[PDB]
Amino acid sequence: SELDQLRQEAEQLKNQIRDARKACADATLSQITNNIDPVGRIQMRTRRTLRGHLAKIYAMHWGTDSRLLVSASQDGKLIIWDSYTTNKVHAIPLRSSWVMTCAYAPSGNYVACGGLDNICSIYNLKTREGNVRVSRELAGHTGYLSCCRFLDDNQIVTSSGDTTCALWDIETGQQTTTFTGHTGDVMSLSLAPDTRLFVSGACDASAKLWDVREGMCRQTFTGHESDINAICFFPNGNAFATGSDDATCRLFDLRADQELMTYSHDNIICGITSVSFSKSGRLLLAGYDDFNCNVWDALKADRAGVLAGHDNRVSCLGVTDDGMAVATGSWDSFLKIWN
Amino acid sequence: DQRNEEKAQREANKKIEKQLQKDKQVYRATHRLLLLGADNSGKSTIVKQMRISGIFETKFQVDKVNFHMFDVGGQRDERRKWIQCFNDVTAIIFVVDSSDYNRLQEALNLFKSIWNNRWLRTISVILFLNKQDLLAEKVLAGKSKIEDYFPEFARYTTPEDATPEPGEDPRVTRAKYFIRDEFLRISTASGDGRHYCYPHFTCAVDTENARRIFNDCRDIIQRMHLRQYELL
Amino acid sequence: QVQLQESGGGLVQPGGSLRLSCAASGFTFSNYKMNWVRQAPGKGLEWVSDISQSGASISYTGSVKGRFTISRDNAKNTLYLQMNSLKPEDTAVYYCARCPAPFTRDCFDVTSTTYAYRGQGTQVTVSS
Amino acid sequence: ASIAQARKLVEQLKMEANIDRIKVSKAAADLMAYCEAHAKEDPLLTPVPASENPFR
Amino acid sequence: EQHDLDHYLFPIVYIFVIIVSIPANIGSLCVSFLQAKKESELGIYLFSLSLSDLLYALTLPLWIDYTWNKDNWTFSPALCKGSAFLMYMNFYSSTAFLTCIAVDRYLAVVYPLKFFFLRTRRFALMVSLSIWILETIFNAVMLWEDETVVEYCNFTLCYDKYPLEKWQINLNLFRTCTGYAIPLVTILICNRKVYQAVRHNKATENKEKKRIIKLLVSITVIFVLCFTPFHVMLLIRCILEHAVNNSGKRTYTMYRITVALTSLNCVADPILYCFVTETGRY
């Protein structure tokens, strides 16, 4: 019938793509990088231990200026604190206590939360009245929100459990472009510094790079064997790292369109929950289910240190824009700043 | 000014901490329950009998104890990811229609997945076998036989520790306790005293399900205190 | 990329035997517990059997106990399920679904309407 | 519908096919050059004295 | 004073108590502070009780040598007065902490869904501080008075003589009432109620029910065996002296013996509250 030979052509296209991608293979990152002096064991200590959350922490996000931090907790709070003096500059109660992501605007005046209610709530942190209040209740998605990022003060990118990513105009609230193509539900998204491209990680072991203006998917990356729980762009914008339940974290580049290295050890076993690069890109920091985070050498694929010190599992991980600190949130209701 | 604003930051911090303590007291008092079941399981009937977008939230209180009950309906059937949020609830209220022999295997599989999950492995399950009147009627009917679907029913007898109704009729009792033991075999396969299931027999007419939930939550918290206020 | 290619589906007389294979190329095999999922015409997806790693802790659904058997060879990344003494009520399409995560004893959404790690599957028909 | 959804996989995979590629060695060299050219700035990569640290 | 019992059985008993109490008390302080970090009021109560036990362990050697040298305090009289004050305050602080921990366990197990405000770190610290302060205030009465007793054959029989102060007899009655009677009855009631609650529990297997039964009965029996003879014989001395306004020497001798039996509590309670304790075992 039509379906049989159409799937035959699809498999043929897969064969052609795989052959072309293998033609790009000349040498692995190891074969070029093997003659670089190793970074060496680096030590990072818990400079600050922010506390005040009554339940597990699900997501954190830094700001444009690497001072203010927002944390999302399932007890129903989106409280934000000043990391320098360990002071809570605001506390936001939520209509729905189940929140799985939080976003700090790149202008330090809006914050967004969203969880199982399928509604992205935007709060006005810099209101004239001085009292935080929900600004626009972004509704229309048919699934739990997994990650939201502020493209601008007026545009936001949200990824939900209904296998869709969206671009919302906050002024009106209606969707602008709907990103479809994932078979599974998307868990994490990461905007590029160029703010014209972004990659998404769903539970179908596939990484899809979208373009915000066109609304299509440019390239598709498939190297994992399990659900993707974290994704992050390399600082230059031509690579991105991906975490998964398969106890590995891989790095794909965009131009060659294939994976570069896999960062994993035999005893890792547990999955990866959050991943983020340093500003230079030499160090890849990945959260883990076994109550700790590991510091990976992005080019040597060797462990350089562990940020152990968390009681429960590590849920979120964020490196500041200046790169002077790294913050990890955990399910023990404690957020720690490492430096 | 810097000193003036630095002291200003402290006062806002203190005000937040005063509110946080006032909210921490309410959070620990209130108990959270997750309601799981299929479309025909019968969650609506019980949720109406204790009550009087996306997640449906129902609040009931008994013996001056506040209970928060969540029902997740807006999500898709895929639940391997959003079920991880409820790793801290007091208990998981599982509702199973015992009168449908075709969805029983799916209910057992869901119970097995919930029980052996790494994140919910410490959450006790208050099992609610609902709509027992339909089971009794269909057992006296004889049109549908459990032998067709569950082939271990033939070599099985009601346990001594049973509480049959005066009008239960032994076949209904045997069938009910077969379903309950089918679930309990999964329950006892893995898990220490941290994990436990509390099967209950309920129907659409039952109006005391809230009190049963209260008693089982009392037992769960009692076991937790046995562990933490070291006595165990 | 993860791929699960099924095989063996065909027309068989009621009471015969046919063997269902499942090629599993795209991931490490021995660290995943796989299932079998069927879907009859005019019905939803339903469980058939499940096998853990190393060929232990085997389970079947109640309708096909004894008649069905499941086995895996990690040396070949394959899953088999042998159907013997078929009945007209076994007409369905069989899927070689896999557990979402490795080193895990709980399988979730293996019978969901849209699953990432499940093959297109072969149609098994029984008629006189 | 099944042929409808499956066809969308064909056109999208066709679009991903006609995309200019580069050798992995060149992307590796670019990644290495970016990592090396910015090594001095990152405090995490190279421990900076306590004066620059705002958390010490 | 026979002085042979005091020269032989007292020193061995007290040195044994010291050597086993000191590490046990230190370990209990460590585990109790760790539990207090984890928001456990039982941690605060255990810390207070272990501090009392270690205070007794530290103050032991003075009284050990006192009993060794035929109950003659060749050191300064203020030293003997301070040592006696420390011993008394330790005993009654331990009693009050034991009744508090029993009441806390009962309030937590029997009523797990209620009485949240009585189970917090703030209340636990309040109770511990109040208990310490009240114990010091109550036992300052002897500090203001004199306990060194000069007895020429000269021997300073510090708090060892038949008879002694009438106000010390009133303090006898007050101590034997409010430091032992209330803790004893409250511990009995609370432990029995906890047993009743644990019996009807469903999650607890039969083996763990038996373990809890044994532990609770052991707590009660150890408390009674280490504290009943002290205050019972103290009341016996009160009714042998105040009523009558050799046998008296023997009565004071067995009173001394009861003192050593109570000294055994400082090694009895830390293990039974922290080592059989699984959480502290980890």
Name the residue range of residue D37's domain: 3-55
Q: Are B118 and C106 in contact (CB under 8 A)?
A: yes
Sign of the Cα pseudo-torsion (C62, C64, C68, C71, in order):
negative
Say whether B228 and E279 touch across the interface (CB within 8 A).
yes
Q: Which residues of B touch E198 (CB under 8 A)?
A: 226, 231
- Torsion sign, CA atoms C3, C7, C10, C12: negative
Return d(Cα B191, Cα B115) in angstroms, integer. 8
Dist CA B170 CA B176 (whole Å): 10
b/e A38-70 (16+ beta carbons within 10 angstroms → b): ebeeeebebebebebbbbbbbbbbbbeebbbbb
Q: Which of E116, E201, E212 shows the shortest C-beta gap to B29? A: E116
Q: Is B17 on the interface with A (CB under 8 A)?
A: yes
CB contact under 8 A, C62 and B112: no
Chain B and chain E touch, per 3+ beta carbon pairs within 8 A = yes
Q: What is the DSSP letter of B213?
A: H
Interface residues from chain E to B (CB-CB < 8 Å):
40, 42, 104-105, 108-109, 112-114, 116, 194, 197-198, 201-205, 208, 211-212, 215, 277-280
B219-223 own/partner pairs: CB under 8 Å, 24+ apart: B219/E201, B219/E202, B219/E203, B220/B90, B220/B91, B220/B124, B220/B196, B220/E203, B221/B90, B221/E112, B221/E113, B222/E109, B222/E112, B222/E197, B222/E201, B223/B193, B223/B194, B223/B196, B223/E201, B223/E203, B223/E204
**B18 contacts chain A (CB < 8 A):** no
Token pair listed for A313: 């599992």
Domain parsing of chain E, residue ranges? 4-281
Structural tokens at position B146 = 């459990």
Q: How far is CA B17 from CA A151, A334, B21, B127, in A?
A: 33, 16, 6, 39
Q: Please state whether at least 3 CB pairs lie below 8 Å between chains E and C.
A: no
DSSP states along chain E: ---HHHHHHHHHHHHHHHHHHHHHHHHHHHHHHHHHHTT-HHHHHHHHHHHHHHHHHHHHHHHHHHHHTTT---S-HHHHHHHHHHHHHHHHHHHHHHHHHHHHHHHHHTSTTS--TTSSHHHHHHHHHHHHHHHHHHHHHHHHS----B-----B-TT--SS--HHHHHHHHHHIIIIIIHHHHHHHHHHHHHHHHHHH-SSS-HHHHHHHHHHHHHHHHHHHHHHHHHHHHHHHHHHHHTS---HHHHHHHHHHHHHHHHHTHHHHHHHHHHTS-HHHH-
Is A118 in contact with B74 (Cβ distance < 8 A)?
Answer: yes
Dihedral, CA of residue E200, residue E201, residue E205 and residue E206, to nearest 10: -20
- The 10 Å Cβ neighbour count of residue A16 is 13
A87/B10 CB distance under 8 A: yes
CA B9 to chain CA mean position, Å: 45
Find the CB nearest C63 among B106, B112, B149.
B149
A292 touches chain C (CB under 8 A): no
- Substitution target from B2, B5, B7, B16 for chain A, most A beta carbons within 10 A: B16
Query: Is residue B36 left, alpha or beta, with left meaning phi > 0 and alpha meaning psi from -120 to 50?
Result: beta
Burial class (CB in 10 A: 0-12, 13-18, 19+), E115: exposed
Contact check, Cβ <8 Å, B19/A89: no
Alpha-carbon distance of C37 to C119, in angstroms, equals 10
Three-state DSSP state, B21: helix
Distance CA C107, CA C37 (A): 13
Inter-chain touch E279–B220, beta carbons under 8 Å: no
Domains and CATH numbers, chain A: 1-339 (2.130.10.10)
Report helix, strand and coil shares of chain D as percent, to nearest 5: 55, 0, 45
Give B139 to chain E, closest Cα distance, Å: 31
Query: Cβ separation of D42 and A238 shorter than 8 Å?
Result: no
The residues with which B125 forms a beta bridge, in sequence order, are B92, B197
Both tokens of residue C24? 């599993």
Distances (CA, A) of E60 to A130, E35, E77, E260: 63, 28, 16, 11
Q: Which of C62, C100, C112 sits opposite B150 (nearest CB)?
A: C62
**Torsion angles phi and psi, residue A134, rounded to 5:** -65, 135
CB within 8 Å: A20 and D17: yes
Terminal-residue alpha carbon distance, chain B: 57
Chain A: residue nearest C112 by CA?
A184
C-alpha dihedral (A18, A23, A24, A27), degrees to nearest 10: 110
CB distance E149 to E156 below 8 Å: yes
The domain defined by E4-281 carries CATH number 2.40.420.20? no
With contact defined as beta carbons under 8 Å apart, do A126 and A111 qualify? no
Structural domains in chain C plus CATH codes = 3-102 (2.60.40.10)
At residue B231, what are phi and psi to the nearest 5 degrees? -140, 5
Tell me whether B16 touches chain A (CB under 8 Å). yes
- Judging contacts by C-beta atoms under 8 Å, the chain C residues touching residue A271 are 101
Interface A:C, Cβ pairs < 8 A: 38
Q: Is A57 part of the contact surface with chain C (CB cutoff 8 Å)?
A: no
What is the spatial distance between Cα C67 and Cα C82, in angstroms, rounded to a whole number? 8
Q: With an 8 Å Cβ cutoff, is B150 touching chain C?
A: yes
Cβ-Cβ contacts under 8 Å, D15 against chain A: 216
Residue D37 sits in a domain of what CATH number? Answer: 4.10.260.10
CATH tag, B31-228: 3.40.50.300
Closest CA to E129 of E70, E191, E44: E44
Option in A87, A118, A185 nearest B78 (CB): A185
The answer to whether the Cβ–Cβ distance between A144 and B17 falls below 8 Å is no
Q: Contact A225/C103, CB-based, under 8 Å? A: no
B77, B109, B118 member nearest C47 (Cβ):
B109
Number of domains in chain D: 1
Q: Which residues of A220-239 are buried (b: 16+ CB within 10 A; e: fewer)?
A: bbbbbbbbbbbbbbbbbebb
**Chain B residue closest to E200 (CA)?**
B219
Beta-carbon contacts below 8 Å between A and D: 151
Give yes or no for B103 touching C (CB within 8 A): no
Residues of C whose CB is below 8 A from A225: 2, 26-28, 102
Q: Nearest by CB to D44, from A217, A236, A283: name it.
A: A283
Question: In chain C, positions 16-75, which contact chain A (CB-CB < 8 Å)?
Answer: 26-28
